[PDB]
Amino acid sequence: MPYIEKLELKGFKSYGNRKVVIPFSKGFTAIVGANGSGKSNIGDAILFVLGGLSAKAMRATRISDLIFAGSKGEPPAKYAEVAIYFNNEDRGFPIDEDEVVIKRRVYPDGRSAYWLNGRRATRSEILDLLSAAMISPEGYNLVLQGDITKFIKMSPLERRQLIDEISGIAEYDAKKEKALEELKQAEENLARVDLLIKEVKKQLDKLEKERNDALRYLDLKERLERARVALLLGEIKRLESMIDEGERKRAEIEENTIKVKSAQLRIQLEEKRRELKHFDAALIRSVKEVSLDLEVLRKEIEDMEAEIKALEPVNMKAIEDFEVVERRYLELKSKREKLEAEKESIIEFINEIEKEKKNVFMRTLEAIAKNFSELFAKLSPGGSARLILENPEDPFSGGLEIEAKPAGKDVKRIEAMSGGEKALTALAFIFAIQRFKPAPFYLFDEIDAHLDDANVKRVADLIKESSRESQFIVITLRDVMMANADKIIGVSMRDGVSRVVSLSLEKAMKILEEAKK
């Protein structure tokens, strides 16, 4: 994780127009000074520079009254400006730099302005990058005045969400979401195929009926034509036994009426022979070998011609149209089943994600609860306390509550915490998370305001131990807290401005027992 190398104020609250550079130990730095030395405005500075639009939380009546209103010896500032410098040699910030520098400036008409590493940035870019570096998750690591009370009135449902962040389930939620995209696509496709199958299946059945009519029209057509060739082979045998004597009548009846109609008998005859010279040989022989009797053939032809007139109209495209629509039918039935299997598969995957997600949540949730127990016993010896999941089966729709028991005292949920018990509990929680997933820094202004000495000593020890992996910036006036800091920054007021001096254990001792009279 990154960490604050220093902080610069120009024109900010109680600090003058002079730029002010506040350097920070990588571990435990302690801001100390008397009531109203303005030591706490440094906390407010940090919230200001992290894009805090909080107004009340920066303890200015309005956004513009974060600006030096002027003092006896210095003119009012033209604006308020804070620059914060992070060491990024670990690349917690998605920036290919080891120093990420964020400067924010607010003008008297309320407008702000940001910069990372000198280029103008918008607020959503500063915010999204501070999130990527998990700087201040829900601001749990920024504990300003009144935050403990805000955290105690906090609902269980409001408490879980920070555990989600810490556990890091977002990566599973990104996968799940693309899985649900593909599932959505999968069944709209699937629904398209269903609508195509319904029409195609109905079109196919028109075509089955037309196909079959076209087929029997075909059969009738063919029988009708062989019968036509049949009636015709007979039609000359008869006409052949006719002219055998129908022109033999000539040399018997004499005045050439018999020459004319026997030239008719020969004139119909000739051509109803040559007519079959033009019929195919396969047809002519698949009939040359069946019946005769001419008038039954003409009655039967008249019939066959009639039931052809029945079926009409027929659509002969149907015979080929059928095949094509049936292939389309069988393929839609094929596609559907593959779509439907694809859908089921996506569903199984989406269920794998949720259960992975939940496991990561519970593993995180249980680690922190173990930690929470220990540390609270450490701050209130002989005591214990418990994190409680509201919905053990679907944690993501439940809240998360706390219950504590101080040694020989009554079990209370966080709702009903009041004295410094409220504070020691809030700090067990905070430290529980910090041992699982250290934030880059923690900011503690006051929080010792309501603990006795024996308490503040264990907190300072706890802070001192944890600083081996996290940065601690504690704004205090209690000597025991001062005692373990690696660095002490002093903050005092002369003639209406605040000043910061890089101090010393016993110097700070002196100044903070002289001011206590």
Numbering used by the authors: 1 to 254, 907 to 1169
Paper text:
Multi-subunit SMC complexes control chromosome superstructure and promote chromosome disjunction, conceivably by actively translocating along DNA double helices. The heads undergo ATP-dependent engagement and disengagement to drive SMC action on the chromosome. Here, we elucidate the architecture of prokaryotic Smc dimers by high-throughput cysteine cross-linking and crystallography.
To understand how the Smc joint connects to the Smc head at the end of the Smc rod, we next solved the structure of PySmcHd-CC80, a Pyrococcus yayanosii Smc head attached to a long coiled coil that includes the Smc joint. Remarkably, these residues form a straight line on the surface of the molecule, the presumptive 2-fold symmetry axis of the Smc rod. The resulting Smc rod fragment shows an intimate association between the two PySmcHd-CC80 monomers with little steric clashes. While the Cα-Cα distance is relatively large (>20 Å) for some residues, indicating that the model of the PySmcHd-CC80 dimer is not a perfect representation of the structure of native Bs Smc-ScpAB, overall there is excellent alignment of most pairs of experimentally identified Bs Smc axial residues.
